[PDB]
Structure formats: structure tokens, C-alpha cells
């Protein structure tokens, strides 16, 4: 019944693949809501012009 979101931001210089390093993720927000989440998507910021 709790939705947890953790987040972290890092400066990067490598192009193609994920960087090889270690860095923990801090808690960002907790939400007290009850849903039976099973699938998700993603949203894009298209330039409607």
C-alpha cells in the first residue's frame, strides 16, 4: 500500500554504455496509496510545431 520512489543524479562523461562505478540511491518520496500496479509506460516531450 505504499509507493516508494528513490532517485539520484550524477555527472557522466561516457557516451554509449552505463558507467562503471558505485553510488547509492537516496529515498525521494513515499506515497500512501493502494493500487495493484502491474504495467507502465513512458512519456516523451515531443516538439509540437
Partner 1 sequence: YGFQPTYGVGYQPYRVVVLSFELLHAPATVCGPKKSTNLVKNKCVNFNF
Ligand X SMILES: *[C@@H]1O[C@H](CO)[C@@H](O)[C@H](O)[C@H]1NC(C)=O
18 touches, from ligand X, partner 1, none (C-beta below 5 to 8 Å by class): none
Main-chain dihedrals φ then ψ at residue 21, nearest 5 degrees: -175, 175
Least distance from C-beta 28 to partner 1, angstroms? 19
- Convert 1-48 into a string of H (helix), E (strand) and C (coil): CCEEEEECCCCCCCCCCCCCCCCCCEEEEEECCCCCCCCCCCCCCCCC
Contacting positions for partner 1 (CB under 8 A): 1-2, 32-34
Quick one: 27 or 46, whose CB is closer to ligand X? 27
Residues forming the site for ligand X (CB under 6 A): 9, 11, 34-36
Amino acid at each position: 500500500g505504499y509507493f516508494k520512489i528513490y532517485s539520484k543524479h550524477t555527472p557522466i562523461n561516457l557516451v554509449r554504455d552505463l558507467p562503471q562505478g558505485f553510488s547509492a540511491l537516496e529515498p525521494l518520496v513515499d506515497l500512501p496509496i493502494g493500487i495493484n500496479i502491474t504495467r507502465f509506460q513512458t512519456l516523451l516531450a515531443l516538439h509540437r510545431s
